[PDB]
């Protein structure tokens, strides 16, 4: 199909997305930057989708965190998400797509702005949400590995898919974990979708970058980085440590598994066969240029190797 402005897409129903793409790159992502609004929109796709429990309900990736914001922004795990919800709600009101489709489209367009990134498959047509998420369905950084794996498994993700989804923390920072140092990132390259998060979380902790007693925070290996306790434990727990190390220096695996597992997350609560594939509307992301590395001045002796089968690689 050729859209009324001359851009092309495989299925004509997808043409309605091109004005929405242009508005979000200019007016939500500040000129198609890989910056805080993209990171917040990617976080939003998970706090919308993960509201999905076979036993308790919620519609998954349904736009409920926007449509029922008054409820879901009261849940403590959703602290700080009201800012991105408030920024996105007018685009949903102005354009003619459901909040569920908007949150997943904005997350995929955002990830495409980041070097190393991927085009997450995108499907159009989710109906409006009909119920708020149940409470207590979002993992917290102070939850155990067994708690996080059981929650994610209840929503349909195996332990290795949890590690693949956490490649998101390669383009991520925290404002609430230690409110004294907002914007401190989880890896040293928060505008590049790369393996540094999987490397840096395997280093021995050394210090706290701000204050020392924050719930859910582990010591970080670097003054300019913050570490969640959940990431500290997942990189070391025998259930997930070999998969975590397998992503280091493995950008093809990070890209293939993040795109596929994000698509599965974006479709929680939905049926692909009832929607229209509009994948090819997402922009083509830049590629990486620099090699994966330990931080300068660190060595293998600073790595806490946690996979018995396979030594951590020389970088
Ligand atoms: C599985 C357990 C997870 C835990 C415990 C967890 C925890 C957290 C925390 C505590 C923050 C910082 C919030 C703040 O203080 O500002 C955060 C940020 C973020 N998370 Fe995760 N998360 C998890 C999984 C995920 C998943 C699956 C995604 C995929 C989309 C995701 C995407 C992001 C992003 C992109 C940010 C950065 C937000 C920003 O820079 O504005 N998280 N996460
Ligand atoms: Ca939801
Ligand atoms: Ca990174």
Within this chain, do residues 210 and 240 fall inside the same structural domain, yes or no?
yes
Q: How far apart are CA 228 and CA 214, in angstroms?
A: 10
Within this chain, do residues 34 and 14 fall inside the same structural domain, yes or no?
yes
- The stretches of the chain forming alpha helices (DSSP H) are 17-27, 36-49, 64-67, 69-72, 82-94, 99-112, 145-154, 159-165, 196-200, 229-234, 241-247, 251-266
Which ligand 1 atom sits closest to the C-alpha of 228?
Answer: 10
Q: Is-contact 172 43, C-beta < 8 A?
A: yes
Within this chain, do residues 144 and 21 fall inside the same structural domain, yes or no?
no
The CATH number linked to 64 is 1.10.520.10
Nearest to 119 by CA among 273, 266, 224, 2: 266
Residue nearest to atom 11 of ligand 1 (CA): 174
For residue 272, what are the domain limits?
A: 1-138+250-289
Within this chain, do residues 55 and 41 fall inside the same structural domain, yes or no?
yes
Nearest to 133 by CA among 109, 160, 151, 153: 151
Please, what's the b/e burial string for 140-173 (b: 16 or more CB within 10 A of its CB; e: otherwise)? bbebebeebbebbeebebebbbbbbbbbbbbbbb
Within this chain, do residues 197 and 308 fall inside the same structural domain, yes or no?
yes
4 Cα–ligand 1 center, Å = 38
Within this chain, do residues 16 and 80 fall inside the same structural domain, yes or no?
yes
The CATH number linked to 164 is 1.10.420.10
- What resolution (Å)? 1.5
Virtual torsion, Cα 249, 250, 251, 254, nearest 10 deg: -130
Q: How far apart are CA 61 and CA 95, in angstroms?
A: 19
Looking at the DSSP bridge assignments, the partners of residue 184 are 174
Within this chain, do residues 170 and 215 fall inside the same structural domain, yes or no?
yes
Residue 277 half-sphere exposure toward CB, CA atoms < 13 A: 8
43 Cα–ligand 1 center, Å = 6
Q: Which residues are designated catalytic?
A: 47, 164
Q: How many domains does the chain have?
A: 2
CB of 76 sitting under 6 A from ligand 1: no
CB of 39 sitting under 6 A from ligand 1: yes
Q: How far apart are CA 74 and CA 195, in angstroms?
A: 33
Within this chain, do residues 26 and 60 fall inside the same structural domain, yes or no?
yes
- Radius of gyration over every alpha carbon of the chain, rounded to an integer in angstroms: 19
Residue nearest to atom 8 of ligand 1 (CA): 141
């Amino acid at each position: 199909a050729t859209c009324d402005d001359g851009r092309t897409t495989a299925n004509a129903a997808c043409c309605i997305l091109f004005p929405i793409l242009d508005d979000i790159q200019e007016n939500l992502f500040d000129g198609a930057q890989c910056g805080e609004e993209v990171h917040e929109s990617l976080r939003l796709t998970f706090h919308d989708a993960i509201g999905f429990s076979p036993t308790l309900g919620g519609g998954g990736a349904d736009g409920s965190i926007i449509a029922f914001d008054t409820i879901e922004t009261n849940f403590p795990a959703n602290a700080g998400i009201d800012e991105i919800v408030s920024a996105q709600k007018p685009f949903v009101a102005k354009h003619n797509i459901s909040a569920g489709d908007f949150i997943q489209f904005a997350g995929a367009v955002g990830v495409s702005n980041c070097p190393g990134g991927v085009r997450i498959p995108f499907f159009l047509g989710r109906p409006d949400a009909v119920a708020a998420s149940p409470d207590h369905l979002v993992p917290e950084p102070f939850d155990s590995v067994d708690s996080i794996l059981a929650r994610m498994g209840d929503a349909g993700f195996s332990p290795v898919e949890v590690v693949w989804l956490l490649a998101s923390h390669s383009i991520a920072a925290a404002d609430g974990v230690d409110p004294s140092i907002p914007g401190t990132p989880f890896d040293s390259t928060p505008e590049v979708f790369d393996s540094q998060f999987f490397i840096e979380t395997q280093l021995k902790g050394r210090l706290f970058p701000g204050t020392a007693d924050n719930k859910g925070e582990a010591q970080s290996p670097l003054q300019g980085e913050i570490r969640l306790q959940s990431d500290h434990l997942l990189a070391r727990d025998p259930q997930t440590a070999c998969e975590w190390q397998s992503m280091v220096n493995n950008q093809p695996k990070i890209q293939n598994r993040f795109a596929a597992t994000m698509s599965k997350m974006a479709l929680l609560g939905q049926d692909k066969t009832k929607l229209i594939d509009c994948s090819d509307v997402i922009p083509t992301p830049p590629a990486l240029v620099g090699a994966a590395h330990l931080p300068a001045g660190f060595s293998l002796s600073d790595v806490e190797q946690a996979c018995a089968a396979t030594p951590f690689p020389a970088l």
